[PDB]
């Protein structure tokens, strides 16, 4: 649970997250899905300390689902990201902080725009065209800085994402067992089952 | 420079050594040959602290080559392994020890027998049918304990070695960038260029 990438293209947000889970010197799982659907058009990927990641993610999910039922309305990606940021900013000065970094990929149905938010465990929020956490950006950002356009199609975004993963697979010492890729657009959230 | 395996079959010794070299968070090389030919029928693979490994290996190589010229005679694998062990036992109580673990694969032309010696940086020598250093044995020894016979052909040894590498590639958190495989037999030392 170390590698999470995000890229916002023309009409969608794409989140790529590694599949590996390591306990000690052994890789326990190579098919782990490091993501939760917060609402029909909002997806959150996560990475950080063991346990805290899923617990935090599910806690956020429950709160957004509660809001959705109460108001019969889906919160905007911006509203969700602000809620999440506050929870992490709250958490960093707690007795035992939740060591969790997240990417929030959402499609705003009101504005008809994809949106990608990057939030670290301190509650540091930034809206970006593409983002990552940990060391992931060190390997991938030079490629994204070079190739990225805001008018890219979903298919071009996936191709640029493949190049980022290939560079990670070449120069990173750790084996992260590939990535699960999910797309967030006007029609909702779907998983790319061949990557 | 972490993964080195060895297996002694019927008529040869096979050494498999990883290709990766890592500096910091970046993999610098994925084609590094972690081995030195000490004599025509004696090969030594090595793993340990950066720098010390090659320096020690080359120092041993120079000494065996010097002996070969002086006496016009190739030392037995046993004699070479004893020389190497003494150098490491000497080294462990030095001001700054050489942090180097080695496998010595040799074919004894007098006895017409393959021989595999495992020596760690403390000077702990053992003759084995198959061996490894570091954590390599934790993943591979259960397979070797199960499948190994002393009458195996070179081709069967390579197949068992492939299974060991596949298990390493599955359950090890680190990407070691595959292995270079070399065979030591009566005709000398050769490299398996497709593995």
């Amino acid at each position: 649970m170390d590698i999470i990438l995000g890229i916002r293209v023309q009409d969608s947000v794409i989140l790529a997250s590694s599949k590996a889970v390591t306990r000690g010197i052994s890789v326990l799982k190579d098919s782990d899905d490091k993501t939760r659907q917060l609402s029909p058009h909002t997806l959150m990927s996560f990475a950080g300390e063991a346990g805290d990641t899923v617990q935090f993610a599910e806690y956020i999910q429950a709160n957004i689902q509660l809001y959705s039922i109460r108001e019969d309305y889906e919160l905007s990606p911006q509203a969700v990201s602000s809620f999440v940021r506050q929870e992490l900013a709250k958490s960093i000065r707690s007795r035992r902080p939740y060591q969790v970094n997240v990417l929030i990929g959402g499609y705003d149905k009101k504005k008809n725009k994809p949106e990608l938010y990057q939030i670290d465990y301190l509650g540091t929020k930034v809206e970006l065209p593409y983002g990552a956490h940990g060391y992931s950006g060190f390997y991938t950002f030079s490629l994204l800085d070079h190739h990225y356009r805001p008018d890219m199609t979903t298919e071009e975004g996936l191709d640029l994402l493949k190049l980022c993963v290939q560079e990670l697979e070449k120069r990173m010492p750790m084996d992260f067992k590939g990535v699960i890729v999910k797309i967030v657009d006007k029609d909702g959230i779907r998983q790319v089952d061949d990557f | 420079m972490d993964i080195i395996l060895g297996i002694r079959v019927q008529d040869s010794v096979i050494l498999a050594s990883s290709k990766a070299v890592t500096r910091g968070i970046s993999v610098l090389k994925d084609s590094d040959d972690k081995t030195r030919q000490l004599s025509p029928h004696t090969l030594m693979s090595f793993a340990g602290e950066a720098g010390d490994t090659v320096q020690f290996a080359e120092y041993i190589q120079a000494n065996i080559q010097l002996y070969s010229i002086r006496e016009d005679y190739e030392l037995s694998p046993q004699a070479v392994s004893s020389f190497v062990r003494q150098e490491l036992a000497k080294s462990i109580r030095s001001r700054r020890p050489y942090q180097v673990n080695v496998l010595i694969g040799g074919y004894d032309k007098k006895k017409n027998k393959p021989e595999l010696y495992q020596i760690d940086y403390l000077g702990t020598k053992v003759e084995l049918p198959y061996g490894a250093h570091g954590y390599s044995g934790f993943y591979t020894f259960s397979l070797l304990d199960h499948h190994y016979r002393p009458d195996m052909t070179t081709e069967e040894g390579l197949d068992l070695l492939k299974l060991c590498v596949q298990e390493l590639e599955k359950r090890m958190p680190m990407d070691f960038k595959g292995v270079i495989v070399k065979i030591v037999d009566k005709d000398g030392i050769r490299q398996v260029d497709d593995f």
Partner: protein, 125 residues
């Protein structure tokens, strides 16, 4: 340590110890070297005053310094072993530090330097 200057100049400008060392070479068995177009041959005399000799184990007159260079000699046999050992060590030392084997000229220059050193160092002949 023994520091006595054994190799010294004489009034006529000769170093007699070096010249007497040449007389030892004159006494030694004949050695010959001939280079062809694509080879070099080293021939050596074996004095037949010594029979009942075991030729398998008796020190051969031609010695490999490396896999590509050889050395033969004339003079004191025991002296030659010291030069051969030093040469062999230097050959491996070169391969280790420079990653190329010695050239024949380099190896010659080294051995010749050792010989020179022993003509103006104290306590040695």
């Amino acid at each position: 340590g023994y520091d006595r200057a054994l190799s010294i100049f004489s009034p006529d400008g000769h170093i007699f110890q070096v010249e007497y060392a040449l007389e030892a070479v004159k006494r030694g068995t004949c050695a010959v070297g001939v280079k062809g177009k694509n080879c070099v041959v080293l021939g050596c005399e074996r004095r037949s005053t010594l029979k009942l000799q075991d030729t398998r184990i008796t020190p051969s007159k031609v010695s490999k310094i490396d896999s590509h260079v050889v050395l033969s000699f004339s003079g004191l046999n025991a002296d030659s072993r010291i030069l051969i050992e030093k040469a062999r060590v230097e050959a491996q030392s070169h391969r280790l530090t420079l990653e190329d084997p010695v050239t024949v000229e380099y190896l010659t220059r080294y051995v010749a330097g050792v010989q020179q050193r022993y003509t103006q160092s104290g306590g040695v002949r």
